[PDB]
Amino acid sequence: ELDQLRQEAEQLKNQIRDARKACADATLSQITNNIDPVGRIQMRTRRTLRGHLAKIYAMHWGTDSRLLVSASQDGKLIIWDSYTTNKVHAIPLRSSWVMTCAYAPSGNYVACGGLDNICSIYNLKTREGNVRVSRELAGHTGYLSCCRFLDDNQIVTSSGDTTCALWDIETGQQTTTFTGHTGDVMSLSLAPDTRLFVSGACDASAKLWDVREGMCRQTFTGHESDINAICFFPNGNAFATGSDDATCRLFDLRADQELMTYSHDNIICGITSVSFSKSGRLLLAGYDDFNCNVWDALKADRAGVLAGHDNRVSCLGVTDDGMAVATGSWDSFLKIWN
Amino acid sequence: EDKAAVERSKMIEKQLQKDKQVYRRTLRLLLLGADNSGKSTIVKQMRITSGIFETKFQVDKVNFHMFDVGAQRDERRKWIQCFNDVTAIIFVVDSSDNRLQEALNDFKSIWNNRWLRTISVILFLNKQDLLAEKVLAGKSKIEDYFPEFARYTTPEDATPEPGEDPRVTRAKYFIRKEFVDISTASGDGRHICYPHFTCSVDTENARRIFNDCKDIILQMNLREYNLV
């Protein structure tokens, strides 16, 4: 009967709530009343890369912290050298409505996706020196939101049909499918060891997934509206989430609940992009009021502002050795800060 | 080996200049409507697991690209932000009474969204002959769904088409008046709505889109001069 199943669900939820409330003894703000504030952090623009014709939606850094890829709503994907502002590659796409990009850890491949429900994989270094389309992966029933590489032969995607998938490239077939969300899946992040990954999915919920098996391990709730960006902490034992309710939060995978909230009484705009720093002390976030904010991740008090853009800030990224921070926005420019 | 790098950068810049010149003179439109409407007929009415369909046409040596949404779910609050820089949104409505309230609500929600407050809408009230036959026959009564049709009279400055019953004129202008009231409720003056009447077999839609796009760009140009 439906009533019995609903009652069992309610009882399980109440047991979960009791066991969860039986674990909050100390708050993060009370154990951290002896931490020196980082002080004001002033950042200056060192470079400005120009060349796009419409709004940018994504960017990924290279493994060497020198080369980067950018994707725009005009059908182009550019590979830049950041030291000298040179252009190393320009690639035209079959579709103009791009929403994601990824750069291979070995530097040999790139990938892209969007509103055509298809993931395209391009080869970089060939004998002729020309960039050619190597693979097209199809099978999703909704628009793709993000994609990340594991190696030269496996990839992971998340789509707007409430699903994620693990793909084999050479054969061209799906290998695993992860299901269980309720709304659109908006972002996924990969662990440093590449065995677990987390997803945020537009119903005020987040989940953690195991790759080799295909099952859900744990889920987290607490936001009031959709979830927009997600990323891991350096040690792989935490992650941070932004939402369309103008709040940021920090979640942990062992205590299995919420730790810290970043918010303000003046901020009434959501959060678009989030990424941590090398040490895990600065949390950088993009907002829909034209500027980026730099948050002390342990004190929940603002520490800096970056205010050089003229439109919505969409994408933001940090290097592999910690040097530069790159931001891209809806005004077709891209800025390097150090 | 800096010289080779600079040479490659210059070649890429030349290519990007050609691409920009081509890109800057193509207009982009977005098509919206309901399943029981006839937007597919309009798509097949215009001549020069896929997630999006594209059609191309050319009028007076100007190139239009139009886009339609295919295999997607029915929640639209995330991929509707990809169309904030298009020239126009084309909204098609089945004006044969009942689901007109859903159409009103959808148009109202499109009109008030933050990322679409600067974008103009071209309104097609399709399904004309069915409306004519339905209202003329009189089996179903419009007064049941909308009580305000119990006092409305045709404005004295109306310009009806020849050979037409006054009843169908009252009906059609009442339905248009509802949409225009929702349109001018805000009263801001930054974007405009354009209503039209269309049927299943017509051959004059490209010209209408053409003329409204010309008016849109004229307003945008006049605002640059601080001259409006």
């Epitope: 309720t182 709304g183 119903d203 005020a204 009031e224 509206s225 959709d226 369309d244 309710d245 103008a246 009434i268 959501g270 | 779910r73 029915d74 929640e75 639209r76 609050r77 859903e102 609500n105 929600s109 008030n112 969204n113 933050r114």
Partner: nanobody
Framework: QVQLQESGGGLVQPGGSLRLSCAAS????????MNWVRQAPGKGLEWVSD????????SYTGSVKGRFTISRDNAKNTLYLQMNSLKPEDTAVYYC?????????????????????RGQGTQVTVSS
Amino acid sequence: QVQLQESGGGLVQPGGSLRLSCAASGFTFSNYKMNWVRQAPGKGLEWVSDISQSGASISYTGSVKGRFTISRDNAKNTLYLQMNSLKPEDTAVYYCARCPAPFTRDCFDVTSTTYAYRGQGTQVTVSS
């Protein structure tokens, strides 16, 4: 964890009267816009009335003009529908609805495919 739960309803003769009251938990109550929805046998999802943040803007569908009244109770976190002088075509299941975002005036909340922040509903039956 967004939660909405309805109360009231039941059986009532034609020309009767009842009061539908709905309670919420898991979010601030004032920043949002709220709506009423009902579903009749052999139909889809409909719409009835809406009320804004302060209660100073109201909107009704034509079929319940002069019949039903909507109320926001901020302090007690409640939404109210007074319903009177009925017809047999009001027999339906009834849900509340919350807008997806705060500090805005737009709604995309009728979807069959499991809109998230929607209630379970109550049954209203009218006969004699």
